[PDB]
Design a binder for this molecule. Structure first.
Ligand SMILES: C#Cc1ccc(NC(=O)CC[C@]23CN(S(=O)(=O)c4ccc(C(C)(C)C(=O)O)cc4)C[C@H]2C[C@H]2C[C@@H]3C2(C)C)cc1
Length: 375
């Protein structure tokens, strides 16, 4: 039947989409129960521990901590972020090729149990290091770069604050577009021309603003630092020649298991508005559907219910209504500009620095598909 609704105005809370921060976690927990203090210390001290060569031995001396004291969603998500960062640090070390193929059981077991409860793979994903990895400095001030911080970083100078928070702020900007989605579908059922037009224009304007928030990335991230340092800890063990069979989660699985590292495909924004605008469109469709299984399951169910709703695109073009066509086209254009900027960032922060020590084709093809969706 499509999107489930909490009331006449707001989508169901089962989708875990917040009115203010959207797909991001609202007011994330910063501290775990005292019981997990040893976990919190390691995660808070990851930069000096990796730098000093101490991280692995500190992890190796942790006791087994049960997850039963992680009683609510926010604490489980904080715990996943803490254990996820520790796992990446333990596996990659200093990033120079001295990798660990076995995650010690005292981390692997609670991490794998927690991940099973949340239906997330046992590797760091976007939902951890961006969507749950933030705080306000001043609770009474707004959600701005200057008034926020990340909870955890990997190395001093890795630009993880700039990379993660700017990404979060784009997610927060998109939240103003996401909350309009129910009005779009109500307007269509009611045949309310103006309500639909203004909904589409507000979506377009919020996506335009989200693109302006994205532009801040250059002011808080250094390309060399990103490519040579942060990217190490976002790397996974699926098709990776350094862990060709995967990672052994000691005490959970006998055999090694492959899980993919971070991908921009894990943000739900692009598919949210591709689906809404009917814009959605080989082996890349497999990788993209795979990245969907790295999103929180409720967000997956939102994306799926959205596809089950009537098509904005079909409604709009059948009206001989320039205003609706232009408003739809404004949304499409905003999405195209966001993809274009994504390609620029991939080129400046990944492709060039790599050249100095297939992807372009996939992304450029999806951008042109979007541009060909203009009516
Ligand atoms: C664990 C984990 C982990 C950590 C971070 C992320 N980040 C995202 O998913 C961000 C999504 C973004 C994309 N940009 S980005 O700067 O172009 C960007 C480019 C490349 C990548 C990586 C390295 C993961 C890759 O793909 O190789 C990540 C981001 C930032 C965001 C802003 C706009 C464009 C979307 C947006 C719509 C919200 C994923 C997994």
């Amino acid at each position: 039947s499509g999107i489930q609704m909490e009331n006449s105005w707001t989508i169901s809370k089962e989708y875990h989409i917040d009115e203010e921060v959207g797909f991001a976690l609202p007011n994330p927990q910063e501290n775990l129960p005292d019981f997990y203090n040893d976990w919190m210390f390691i995660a808070k001290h990851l930069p000096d521990l990796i730098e000093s060569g101490q991280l692995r031995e500190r992890v190796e001396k942790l006791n087994m901590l049960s997850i039963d004291h992680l009683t609510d969603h926010k604490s489980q998500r904080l715990a996943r972020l803490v254990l996820g960062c520790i796992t990446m640090a333990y596996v990659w070390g200093k990033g120079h090729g001295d990798v660990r193929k076995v995650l010690p059981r005292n981390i692997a077991v609670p991490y794998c149990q927690l991940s099973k409860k949340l239906e997330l793979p046992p590797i760091l994903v976007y939902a951890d290091c961006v969507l749950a990895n933030w705080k306000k400095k001043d609770p009474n001030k707004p959600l701005t770069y200057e008034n926020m911080d990340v909870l955890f970083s990997f190395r001093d100078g890795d630009c993880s604050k700039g990379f993660f928070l700017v990404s979060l702020l784009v997610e927060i900007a998109a939240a103003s577009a996401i909350k309009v989605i129910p009005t779009v579908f109500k307007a269509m059922q009611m045949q309310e021309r103006d309500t639909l037009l203004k909904a589409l224009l507000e979506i377009a304007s919020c996506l335009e603003k989200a693109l302006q928030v994205f532009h801040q990335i250059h002011d808080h991230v250094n390309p060399k630092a990103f490519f040579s340092v942060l990217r190490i800890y976002l790397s996974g063990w699926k098709g990776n020649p350094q862990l060709s069979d995967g990672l052994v989660y000691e005490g959970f699985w006998e055999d090694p298991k492959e899980f993919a590292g971070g991908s921009a495909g894990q943000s739900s924004v692009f598919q949210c508005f591709d689906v809404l605008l009917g814009i959605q469109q080989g082996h890349a469709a497999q990788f993209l559907q795979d990245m969907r299984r790295y999103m929180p399951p409720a967000h997956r169910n939102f994306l799926c219910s959205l596809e089950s709703n009537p098509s904005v695109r079909e409604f709009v073009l059948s009206k001989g209504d320039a205003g609706l066509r232009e408003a739809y086209d404004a949304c499409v254009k905003a999405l195209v500009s966001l993809r274009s900027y994504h390609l620029q960032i991939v080129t400046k922060y990944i492709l060039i620095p790599a050249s100095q020590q297939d992807l372009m084709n996939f992304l450029k093809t999806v951008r042109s598909t979007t541009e060909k969706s203009l009516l």
